[PDB]
């Protein structure tokens, strides 16, 4: 629908956000994913600590370089999550992946842009309440990611400068609605009212 689509990652399940980000991507919808660290995965944090350590041992024997690479930041734990669902070796494949960006936190341009959700990967909706689950950044920080403290520091700072934004907004749309009701009952209004507005 839109040129670009920002996805606040918070409260989304890795594999599902992936699966949808994949197809958004392959049908040519440019997609960017933010607040990647605040992402969820089924299973108590520990199991996922394990699963990741298994991923860790897999490496080319004769040369730990050319073999599997092990990316720690939550964005790229998500990007791998995603790259698997893409025919990534083909043209078509690189094509799509180029139309994607994944971000821990919410960096410039994107924080003043609005950002959406994907109800079919929203955790609160998807998961059975009472199931144990897992935050990405905490899983990532435990496997060598260096930048969690910094991120949630800027975030906390950003989350402030944008309450102000919303505060200002909520007051303006008060006058706006205030003005929109001194117009209530008038002819024109009663006319629109009748055409369904």
């Amino acid at each position: 629908v839109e040129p670009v689509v920002v996805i606040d990652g918070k409260g989304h399940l890795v594999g599902r956000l992936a699966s949808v980000v994949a197809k958004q991507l392959l049908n040519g919808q440019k997609i960017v994913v933010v607040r990647a660290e605040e992402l969820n995965i089924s299973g108590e944090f520990f199991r996922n600590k394990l699963k990741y350590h298994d991923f860790l041992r897999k490496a080319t024997a004769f040369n730990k370089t050319r073999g599997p690479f092990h990316f720690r930041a939550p964005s790229r734990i998500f990007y791998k999550a995603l790259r698997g669902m893409v025919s990534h070796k083909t043209a078509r494949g690189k094509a799509a992946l180029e139309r994607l960006k994944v971000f821990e936190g919410i960096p410039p341009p994107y924080d003043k842009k609005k950002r959406v959700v994907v109800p079919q990967a929203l955790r609160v909706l998807r998961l059975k309440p009472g199931r144990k689950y897992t935050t990405l950044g905490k899983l990532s920080t435990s496997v060598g990611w260096k930048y969690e403290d910094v991120v949630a520091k800027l975030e906390a700072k950003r989350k402030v400068s944008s309450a102000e934004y919303y505060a200002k907004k909520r007051a303006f749309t008060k006058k706006v609605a205030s003005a929109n009701a001194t117009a209530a009952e008038s002819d024109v209004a009663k006319q629109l009212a009748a055409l369904g507005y």
Partner: protein
């Protein structure tokens, strides 16, 4: 106005294909806002045009079009099979195709 559009936006998804043998003579189209095979039966027949540009001016223009027609509904989600004059160039997979409102019935 600002708007001049007289067609519906559609993306160019896949070729009609098996799991591992594809068939270029039929392209599969995603029409905007059409998401059920019923919502889709409206567009059956409506000619499809895929506009694109090039470096060589031709019959006066730097714009050419291949032309097609929606011909049936695809699966369960308002996807749609169409056939064109010449088949579509596979680089176009996930490009923008235009679906028109003619030949209409209203």
């Amino acid at each position: 106005a600002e708007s001049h559009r007289l067609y519906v936006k559609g993306k160019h998804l896949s070729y009609q294909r098996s799991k591992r043998v594809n068939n270029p003579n039929v392209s599969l189209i995603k029409i905007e806002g059409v998401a059920t095979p019923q919502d889709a039966q409206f567009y059956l027949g409506k000619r499809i045009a895929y506009v694109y540009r090039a470096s060589k001016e031709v019959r006066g223009s730097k714009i050419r079009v291949m032309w097609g027609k929606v011909t049936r509904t695809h699966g369960n989600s308002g996807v749609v099979r169409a056939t064109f004059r010449n088949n579509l160039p596979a680089k176009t997979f996930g490009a923008s195709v235009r679906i028109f409102l003619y030949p209409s019935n209203i």
